[PDB]
Amino acid sequence: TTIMAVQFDGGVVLGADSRTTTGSYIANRVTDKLTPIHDRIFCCRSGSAADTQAVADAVTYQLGFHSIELNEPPLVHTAASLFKEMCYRYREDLMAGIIIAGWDPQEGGQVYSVPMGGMMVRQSFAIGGSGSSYIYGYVDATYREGMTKEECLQFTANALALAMERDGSSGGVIRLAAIAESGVERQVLLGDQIPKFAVATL
Amino acid sequence: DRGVNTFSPEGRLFQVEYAIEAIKLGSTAIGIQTSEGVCLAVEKRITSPLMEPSSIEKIVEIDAHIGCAMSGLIADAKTLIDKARVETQNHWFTYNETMTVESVTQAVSNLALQFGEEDADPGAMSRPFGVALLFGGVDEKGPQLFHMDPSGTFVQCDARAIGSASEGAQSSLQEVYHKSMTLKEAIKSSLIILKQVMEEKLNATNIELATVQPGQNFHMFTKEELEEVIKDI
Amino acid sequence: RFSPYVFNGGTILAIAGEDFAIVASDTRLSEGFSIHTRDSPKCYKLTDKTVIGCSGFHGDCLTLTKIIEARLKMYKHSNNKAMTTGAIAAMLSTILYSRRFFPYYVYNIIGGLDEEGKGAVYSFDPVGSYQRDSFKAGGSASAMLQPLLDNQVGFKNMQNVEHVPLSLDRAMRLVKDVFISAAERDVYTGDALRICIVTKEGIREETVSLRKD
Amino acid sequence: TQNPMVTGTSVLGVKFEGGVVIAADMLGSYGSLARFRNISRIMRVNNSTMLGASGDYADFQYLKQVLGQMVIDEELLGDGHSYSPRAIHSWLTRAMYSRRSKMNPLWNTMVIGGYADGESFLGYVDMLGVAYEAPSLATGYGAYLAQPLLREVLEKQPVLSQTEARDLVERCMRVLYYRDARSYNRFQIATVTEKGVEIEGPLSTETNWDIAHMIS
Amino acid sequence: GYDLSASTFSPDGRVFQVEYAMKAVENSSTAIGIRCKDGVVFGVEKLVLSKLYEEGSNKRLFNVDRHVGMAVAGLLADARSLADIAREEASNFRSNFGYNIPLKHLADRVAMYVHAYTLYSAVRPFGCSFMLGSYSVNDGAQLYMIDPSGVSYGYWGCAIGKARQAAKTEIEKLQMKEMTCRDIVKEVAKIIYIVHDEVKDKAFELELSWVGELTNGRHEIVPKDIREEAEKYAKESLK
Amino acid sequence: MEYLIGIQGPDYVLVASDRVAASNIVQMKDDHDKMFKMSEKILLLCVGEAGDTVQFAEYIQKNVQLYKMRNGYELSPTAAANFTRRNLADCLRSRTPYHVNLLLAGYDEHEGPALYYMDYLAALAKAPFAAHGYGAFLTLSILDRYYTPTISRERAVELLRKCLEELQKRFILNLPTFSVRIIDKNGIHDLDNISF
Amino acid sequence: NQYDNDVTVWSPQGRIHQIEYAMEAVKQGSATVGLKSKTHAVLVALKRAQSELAAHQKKILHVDNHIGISIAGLTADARLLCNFMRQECLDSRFVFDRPLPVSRLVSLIGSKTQIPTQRYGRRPYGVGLLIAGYDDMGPHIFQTCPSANYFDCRAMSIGARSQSARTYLERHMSEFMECNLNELVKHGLRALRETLPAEQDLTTKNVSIGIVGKDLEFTIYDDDDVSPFLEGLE
Amino acid sequence: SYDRAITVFSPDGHLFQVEYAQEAVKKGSTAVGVRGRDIVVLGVEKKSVAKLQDERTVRKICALDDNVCMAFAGLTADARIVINRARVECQSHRLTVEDPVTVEYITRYIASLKQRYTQSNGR
Amino acid sequence: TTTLAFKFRHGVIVAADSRATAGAYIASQTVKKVIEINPYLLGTMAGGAADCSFWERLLARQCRIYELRNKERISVAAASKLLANMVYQYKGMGLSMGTMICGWDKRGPGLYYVDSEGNRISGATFSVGSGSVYAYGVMDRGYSYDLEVEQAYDLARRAIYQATYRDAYSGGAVNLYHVREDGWIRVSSDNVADLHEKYS
Ligand SMILES: *[C@@](O)([C@H](CC(C)C)NC(=O)[C@H](CO)NC(=O)CCCCC(C)C)[C@@](C)(O)CO
Ligand SMILES: *[C@@](O)([C@H](CC(C)C)NC(=O)[C@H](CO)NC(=O)CCCCC(C)C)[C@@](C)(O)CO
Ligand SMILES: [Cl-]
Ligand SMILES: [Cl-]
Ligand SMILES: [Cl-]
Ligand SMILES: [Cl-]
Ligand SMILES: [Cl-]
Ligand SMILES: [Cl-]
Ligand SMILES: [Cl-]
Ligand SMILES: [Cl-]
Ligand SMILES: [Cl-]
Ligand SMILES: [Cl-]
Ligand SMILES: [Cl-]
Numbered sequence A: 001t002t003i004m005a006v007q008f009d010g011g012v013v014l015g016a017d018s019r020t021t022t023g024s025y026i027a028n029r030v031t032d033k034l035t036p037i038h039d040r041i042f043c044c045r046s047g048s049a050a051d052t053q054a055v056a057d058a059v060t061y062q063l064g065f066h067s068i069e070l071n072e073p074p075l076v077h078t079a080a081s082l083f084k085e086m087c088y089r090y091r092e093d094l095m096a097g098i099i100i101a102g103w104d105p106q107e108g109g110q111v112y113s114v115p116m117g118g119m120m121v122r123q124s125f126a127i128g129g130s131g132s133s134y135i136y137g138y139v140d141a142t143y144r145e146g147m148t149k150e151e152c153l154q155f156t157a158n159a160l161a162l163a164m165e166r167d168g169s170s171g172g173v174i175r176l177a178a179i180a181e182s183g184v185e186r187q188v189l190l191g192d193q194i195p196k197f198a199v200a201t202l
Numbered sequence B: 001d002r003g004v005n006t007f008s009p010e011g012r013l014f015q016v017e018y019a020i021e022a023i024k025l026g027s028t029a030i031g032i033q034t035s036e037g038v039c040l041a042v043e044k045r046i047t048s049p050l051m052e053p054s055s056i057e058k059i060v061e062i063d064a065h066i067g068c069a070m071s072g073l074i075a076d077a078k079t080l081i082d083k084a085r086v087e088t089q090n091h092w093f094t095y096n097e098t099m100t101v102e103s104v105t106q107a108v109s110n111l112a113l114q115f116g117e118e119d120a121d122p123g124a125m126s127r128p129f130g131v132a133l134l135f136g137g138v139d140e141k142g143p144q145l146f147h148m149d150p151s152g153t154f155v156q157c158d159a160r161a162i163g164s165a166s167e168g169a170q171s172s173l174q175e176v177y178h179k180s181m182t183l184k185e186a187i188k189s190s191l192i193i194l195k196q197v198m199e200e201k202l203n204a205t206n207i208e209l210a211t212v213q214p215g216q217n218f219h220m221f222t223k224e225e226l227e228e229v230i231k232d233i
Numbered sequence C: 001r002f003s004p005y006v007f008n009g010g011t012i013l014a015i016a017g018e019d020f021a022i023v024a025s026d027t028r029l030s031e032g033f034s035i036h037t038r039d040s041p042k043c044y045k046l047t048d049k050t051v052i053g054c055s056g057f058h059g060d061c062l063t064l065t066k067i068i069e070a071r072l073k074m075y076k077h078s079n080n081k082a083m084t085t086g087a088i089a090a091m092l093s094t095i096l097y098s099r100r101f102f103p104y105y106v107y108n109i110i111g112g113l114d115e116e117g118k119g120a121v122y123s124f125d126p127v128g129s130y131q132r133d134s135f136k137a138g139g140s141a142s143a144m145l146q147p148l149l150d151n152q153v154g155f156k157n158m159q160n161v162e163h164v165p166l167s168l169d170r171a172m173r174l175v176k177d178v179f180i181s182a183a184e185r186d187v188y189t190g191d192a193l194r195i196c197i198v199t200k201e202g203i204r205e206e207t208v209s210l211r212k213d
Numbered sequence D: 001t002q003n004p005m006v007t008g009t010s011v012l013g014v015k016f017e018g019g020v021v022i023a024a025d026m027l028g029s030y031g032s033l034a035r036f037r038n039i040s041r042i043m044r045v046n047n048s049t050m051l052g053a054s055g056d057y058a059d060f061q062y063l064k065q066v067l068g069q070m071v072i073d074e075e076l077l078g079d080g081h082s083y084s085p086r087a088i089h090s091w092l093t094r095a096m097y098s099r100r101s102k103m104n105p106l107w108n109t110m111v112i113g114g115y116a117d118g119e120s121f122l123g124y125v126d127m128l129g130v131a132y133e134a135p136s137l138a139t140g141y142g143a144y145l146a147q148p149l150l151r152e153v154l155e156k157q158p159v160l161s162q163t164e165a166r167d168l169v170e171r172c173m174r175v176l177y178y179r180d181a182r183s184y185n186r187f188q189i190a191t192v193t194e195k196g197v198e199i200e201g202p203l204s205t206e207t208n209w210d211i212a213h214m215i216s
Numbered sequence E: 001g002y003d004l005s006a007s008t009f010s011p012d013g014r015v016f017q018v019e020y021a022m023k024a025v026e027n028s029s030t031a032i033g034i035r036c037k038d039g040v041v042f043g044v045e046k047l048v049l050s051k052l053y054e055e056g057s058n059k060r061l062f063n064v065d066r067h068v069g070m071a072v073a074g075l076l077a078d079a080r081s082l083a084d085i086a087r088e089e090a091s092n093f094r095s096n097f098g099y100n101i102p103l104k105h106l107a108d109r110v111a112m113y114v115h116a117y118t119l120y121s122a123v124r125p126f127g128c129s130f131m132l133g134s135y136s137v138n139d140g141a142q143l144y145m146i147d148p149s150g151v152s153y154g155y156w157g158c159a160i161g162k163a164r165q166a167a168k169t170e171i172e173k174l175q176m177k178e179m180t181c182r183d184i185v186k187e188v189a190k191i192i193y194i195v196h197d198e199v200k201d202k203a204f205e206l207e208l209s210w211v212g213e214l215t216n217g218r219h220e221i222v223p224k225d226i227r228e229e230a231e232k233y234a235k236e237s238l239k
Numbered sequence F: 001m002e003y004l005i006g007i008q009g010p011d012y013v014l015v016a017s018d019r020v021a022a023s024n025i026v027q028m029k030d031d032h033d034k035m036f037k038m039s040e041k042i043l044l045l046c047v048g049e050a051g052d053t054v055q056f057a058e059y060i061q062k063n064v065q066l067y068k069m070r071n072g073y074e075l076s077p078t079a080a081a082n083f084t085r086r087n088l089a090d091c092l093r094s095r096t097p098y099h100v101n102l103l104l105a106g107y108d109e110h111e112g113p114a115l116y117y118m119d120y121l122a123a124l125a126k127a128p129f130a131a132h133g134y135g136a137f138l139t140l141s142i143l144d145r146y147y148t149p150t151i152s153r154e155r156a157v158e159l160l161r162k163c164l165e166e167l168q169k170r171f172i173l174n175l176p177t178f179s180v181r182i183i184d185k186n187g188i189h190d191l192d193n194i195s196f
Numbered sequence G: 001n002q003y004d005n006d007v008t009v010w011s012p013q014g015r016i017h018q019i020e021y022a023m024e025a026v027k028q029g030s031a032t033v034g035l036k037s038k039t040h041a042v043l044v045a046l047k048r049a050q051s052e053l054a055a056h057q058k059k060i061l062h063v064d065n066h067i068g069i070s071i072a073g074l075t076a077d078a079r080l081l082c083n084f085m086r087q088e089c090l091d092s093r094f095v096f097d098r099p100l101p102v103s104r105l106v107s108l109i110g111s112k113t114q115i116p117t118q119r120y121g122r123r124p125y126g127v128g129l130l131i132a133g134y135d136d137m138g139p140h141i142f143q144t145c146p147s148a149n150y151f152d153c154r155a156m157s158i159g160a161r162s163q164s165a166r167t168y169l170e171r172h173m174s175e176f177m178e179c180n181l182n183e184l185v186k187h188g189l190r191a192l193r194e195t196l197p198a199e200q201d202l203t204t205k206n207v208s209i210g211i212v213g214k215d216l217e218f219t220i221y222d223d224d225d226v227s228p229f230l231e232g233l234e
Numbered sequence H: 001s002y003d004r005a006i007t008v009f010s011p012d013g014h015l016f017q018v019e020y021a022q023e024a025v026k027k028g029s030t031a032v033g034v035r036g037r038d039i040v041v042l043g044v045e046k047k048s049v050a051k052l053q054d055e056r057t058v059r060k061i062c063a064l065d066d067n068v069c070m071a072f073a074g075l076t077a078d079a080r081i082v083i084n085r086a087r088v089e090c091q092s093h094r095l096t097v098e099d100p101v102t103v104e105y106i107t108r109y110i111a112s113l114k115q116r117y118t119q120s121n122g123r
Numbered sequence I: 001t002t003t004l005a006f007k008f009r010h011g012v013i014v015a016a017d018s019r020a021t022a023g024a025y026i027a028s029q030t031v032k033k034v035i036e037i038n039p040y041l042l043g044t045m046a047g048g049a050a051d052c053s054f055w056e057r058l059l060a061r062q063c064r065i066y067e068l069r070n071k072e073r074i075s076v077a078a079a080s081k082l083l084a085n086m087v088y089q090y091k092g093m094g095l096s097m098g099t100m101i102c103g104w105d106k107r108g109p110g111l112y113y114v115d116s117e118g119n120r121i122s123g124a125t126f127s128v129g130s131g132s133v134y135a136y137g138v139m140d141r142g143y144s145y146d147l148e149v150e151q152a153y154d155l156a157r158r159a160i161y162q163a164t165y166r167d168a169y170s171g172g173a174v175n176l177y178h179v180r181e182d183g184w185i186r187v188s189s190d191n192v193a194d195l196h197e198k199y200s
């Protein structure tokens, strides 16, 4: 797995590879790792498929109920807090590295990391999953303050493609989502649409 | 019908007031505290010559330094006596010392209002204890007599009677008591008073008597030792 | 394997006289090859007549002393008098045994006056075995202190010497000497020696400097 | 926590005349990876008290949540009583000991600094409930690299000015950046005086690499 | 008889035990709240039943969160119990969701707790009514009132206790939507003095609190000097 | 280490058990009794882990006696054996298993003599003869060689003595004396100890 | 009537008769007085003796070094509540290593004692307390009731004929803040003495005194130890 | 679980449930005991006769253990409960003391069982 | 530790050393290993010191309660059984205890061995502790039911002595008690260094 999210002025971009593995067998080559938690709040999942599905389902339930009770859209920070509470409390029984990202009317586009262990921190951009190791350098050199939505989408797709080339544990297609006040726009980059960088032959 | 934890308009618990009235159906017991020790004396109240008098036990040892005389509903007293015994042994176990008479009395008195029907365990106490108790003993404060009743109120007394004829007996105790009175005088005085108040002719089988002294452990008087004291009285 | 224990060092000592008790300890608190602080005494006042010395795992020393303090007040409230030195010792035995299967990693020595006004020392293992002693060393350097006390206070292995009563002044000299000797050889014992002297007049305090290496 | 995940390295503290200063870098490491490079490892508890934590950051965040809520609860009463630095240090000792005794520690080592009633307070609490006070403290590699320098200065001059304590802390942070492979050259300094608690940062030390040309 | 348990309806569909609990609130001296342009102000007529009591004793104004005040009437031990419930609810909300409880949600949660004590022979209804007040830049000023049945509504102005109707008629004279907290405190003090029956109950303390732009959204006691000025204004206005 | 043996004839059951209680390298008692009277015509012989053995046997004993007091008549040997088995098996997977091996001997008015064998797992077998302990390894073949179902009680005591002499000759442990009892229509009889 | 046996039954006037009845238990106890200055808090109690040969019931109890109480009403309820107070104080020293502030302890009593007033088959506590304490905010006198209400007091008296004591305390309370300790205790004794029949006087057998302040842990004076305070009521 | 207080005091110190239990005993068949020099004897009345009854099944005299027996008067179902409880207790005593009960020991046990059912909720 | 006891015509002899150890460190030479349960009943201690002291002190508590409740002395059988039933629940949890319960009751002189493994047995003679093997040898070669009182004291003292000689973990003093029909008495305390002088 490689997961990523990036803030821009008015929203967020999220991205993931699509590979589920047991050992080195690919059990699903087109996994959807970006799961909607509410109308404008998604989570990117890494670690155990069972654990992250169970936790995402439970948070969807909690956040939904909370939202109906308050009669307002939920805060991105609230969604992240609910993940954090569950990931921290059950840290000894879960293997879950989560990014929560979305939009709300109060604070705009926001990205939160909830890594294994269940800490929570807001970030400009976040990467996670085992493939993320191979793109720390790339993201650190390429990130610029003030990127547009379209630039965040390219930045994300590039980072993910590089990770997917090098990490045996990541691959398949790139799933992207952009979230803003106007809604959610999803897309898939496959085959020739995935950014390409040569193998350095002699 | 009302609940067991209902207050009357005078600010008393009905059940406790009624338990106090049950003490008046008991045989008379007397306690006297002197500088030489305490004595406890009780009317047995034999109801048939076929009854074994030694099977009536209204004075009991709590520990070597502490005895207890009871009046009222005697069956109720068993769990209180056992709690007193267990507490003094716990205190010995934990602290390697004897428990004070006051402390024993306090421990028992904390059971008193622990009744009621919707706080507690599946079959906890439904009512107060219909018992009054005199604890007589010796500790580092010297000789000591304490009284306790079903309200959980306890207090030190120089001399005290409880049961049916306690008014009466308490009046004679005011008349004869003095702070410098000897134990042998106290023993005689309490038998003289029991003799007045008892319906039956006093003798060496229808009373019990015990002492505790600074020298000497809890001691129940034998038939032969009672006969000796009865001669003068 | 999280371990719930660590060893923090500390040497303790108590001596019973005819009308006094001494309780003494070094003030170094250690862990591994490091010093946490040079000013952490191992003696705690319990009553006007009783002092306790505690060494071993500092987390347990702190907890146990706070438990003892609460229990002394509970006793005083239920019984209307302060706990005697003997009753504190008996109670500590039960508190230690209550953790028989997850022990307090603490070596305890009580020093105080008994009910006749005489010096009393009680020594403990971590699970609450105890007895009265005439003198006792405990903690990190106890095997260094104890033999000299056996010899000099107990007169052991000596012929042709009068078995005189232990004066406070000589007891004091011995206490300082043995800690000075221990500071030479036990890496954990050092910085300063704190001495509490319990008498009928109260508890007073002396401190003596030790090597800082 | 059985297994710490994202962790913080050393925390330093030193008393000075009129207050206490503490220092900590802004790094959460994930094993050797310098993963979260802008996190604060210092908390203002209330007006008289501050706290710095080494070890597991999620466990620190939990303590911050609990302790923050405790201060709020107390302020609601509006009754003229506040938790002193010593009280907070006591509470923390109990909490860590209690979690140790359940075999489920909070995986942290903490430094509590405060100023109340004319007295500087500086106290340590570790994950096992080992707690004490001292004129200077340093957790982690700071115990080996910083504490020797703190104590040597304090022996020559037990009473430091604020500016002397601040310069001494900066020298220690430099050493730690040279020699601790989990450190990072972006830190905060927090100070407590009569006036309250101030947290400054992000700060950096100057470094010298002349020795790179002294090998042949 | 049909009025001994909260688990028994009367033949006309009333729950008399809840009505009786309401009568305890209606025997109590008066508390008022007023929402205005930039906050909420509370005032209580606090009857002093003995001169031996300290100034401040038996407060009827509470902080239930840093941003939320509570003003009570009725049986004071019941009210304090509810303040503790409100505090626990605010605290738990912050722990679980990670931000300050919105006033309306706090009002609704405590009202459901009150409501739970109106269904059963096992417990009795609370003998208290209370107001909750807050301010924030996002939510503006909010004032809610909750009664022993567990009903909860929002208000521009509100009064509870024995001179409730007389207080409401004075509150209706203010254009509170356009006034500031500093203006409204004087009018709160004025209204308490108007509805106070100086013949029947001899001595009272005025208790004042507020939350608004001027306190940065923190619920706080009105400062002493401002309270004294408001009292002086109220007294002279009585004339 | 502990030896039990039983031999059932036409109208009696003969049983014996060693009398040693050992600990580490020493015999601590040489007159130990491993037999428990359950009722007038039932013996339970119990060996195994210290504590478990007495705790288990005395619990069974008290309950068999309770059954008598409640009902006016005794459990049969077979009912008592099945009761014993139910208890052991029910404890096997509990927090309190009992590590004991047993023989149950009895005489029923209507069914005649019975000998039952039980191991610590609570497998129950009726047998014409049986034995427990390491000593069983050296004596069961002697029983297979010489036992017949009509064996008289004299010859059973002779056969028993062959078994016990074989332990003296061949077994590495010092088991010098044995308790011997017989059960028949007239109850439980003590015979002389067999000693070396 | 149908309204007076259950603490869960409101009367049609908005009252709870069981709570009012519990308050009668305190009005019938022997009188006790509490008062304070800038530096000390004092309790003074009359002790009732059953017969001429009984000791006289304890009225003043130690809670912690900085807190003591005087009781009126059911003695067993007084002990239960005193044990709760003691435990709350011990907890605070254990956790925080500092004394529990007096006003926080009183809040805990209010909250604890309110609970049984709202549940079927439970009863109020039939005891009233005067609480003397000293903390960072100085000396305190608090009063607690069977209703679970409590009061912060300049001075107070509860129990039988305590109206007289309260009248004395109002008359002299402008003097209390500036009193030395001896003056303050004398004022307590004169207030308590107003509760007595004209024949009878304060003696070493019937007076109990409790004192706490800046320099003084909570201390109880009984029997021969009250004599210094009784001599010079001149 | 049913926790009603059943045995309570009345004005004048009476426990009416206990007094009514004693009325039940007074309507039971007569039972008599005499302590001899080296024998003890129990005899009991009746109760019904009735030719079609199996006599064995209604005895009012019962072994508690080998060395202790009892007779009762009153509610026969209640007696069966008490008897079985006492029989269990005799086996605990043997188990933990390795002596048979004294008659006073098992009496004291039965009496305290009875006392508990005058002071426990729901019974 | 070495402890022993034996029944004979004139009651029961009980003897012990006085050493305590923590590994190879000698922690004390003055431990009392014979505990006074009541005036006619003694318990002996071998194994873990805290374990023996705690459980025998609890035994003493229970025996005293028994006496108050039943109005008679507890038997040696019943006392040993109470102790066995208490420790049985803790088997496998690491208690280390080996005790002899020594008294005189209605069946005459009484002696039971009880331990943390669950054993409880009556017998004529026992020795318990790391030095027991050495004590058994000398006790066994001198024991008789018909020993005179002074010969019985001599045997007990000598058996413990010889154990202290061979066993690194036994030493200090030999403390000797005699349970008689009217109570136990303390008979002697002899430092092993003084016995060495005497027996050569
Ligand atoms: C991802 O972390 C990925 C994310 C997951 C949310 C789809 N994780 C997995 O594929 C994990 C192993 O890490 N696999 C599973 O949980 C197993 C699911 C099926 C199990 C049976 C086939 C036995 C990456 C980087 O780990 C993907 O490689
Ligand atoms: C004894 O068995 C002896 C008997 C005991 C009642 C004193 N046991 C011990 O000495 C045991 C052996 O581990 N020691 C302890 O329980 C710890 C004693 C105190 C340690 C200090 C740290 C105070 C013999 C044979 O084991 C004696 O050697
Ligand atoms: Cl998935
Ligand atoms: Cl992660
Ligand atoms: Cl991750
Ligand atoms: Cl992963
Ligand atoms: Cl794939
Ligand atoms: Cl009476
Ligand atoms: Cl970061
Ligand atoms: Cl902060
Ligand atoms: Cl209203
Ligand atoms: Cl009173
Ligand atoms: Cl009362």
Ligand SMILES: [Cl-]
Pocket: G145, G147, G149
């Ligand atoms: Cl009130």
Ligand SMILES: [Cl-]
Pocket: G026, G027, G157, G158, G159, G160, G162
């Ligand atoms: Cl009053």
Ligand SMILES: [Cl-]
Pocket: H113, H116
């Ligand atoms: Cl029962």
Ligand SMILES: [Cl-]
Pocket: I018, I029, I030, I031, I032, I173, I175, I189
């Ligand atoms: Cl010795």
Ligand SMILES: [Cl-]
Pocket: I065, I066, I069
């Ligand atoms: Cl018993």
Ligand SMILES: [Cl-]
Pocket: I120, I121, I122, I123
């Ligand atoms: Cl045996």
Ligand SMILES: [Cl-]
Pocket: I001, I046, I047, I128, I129, I130, I131
């Ligand atoms: Cl051993």
Ligand SMILES: [K+]
Pocket: A163, A164, A165, A166, A167, A168, A169, A170, A171
């Ligand atoms: K790949």
Ligand SMILES: [K+]
Pocket: C182, C183, C184, C185, C186, C187, C188, C189, C190, C211, C213
């Ligand atoms: K050293």
Ligand SMILES: [Mg+2]
Pocket: A051, A093, A094
């Ligand atoms: Mg799992």
Ligand SMILES: [Mg+2]
Pocket: C212, C213
């Ligand atoms: Mg060094």
Ligand SMILES: [Mg+2]
Pocket: F096, F097, I091, I092
């Ligand atoms: Mg087992």
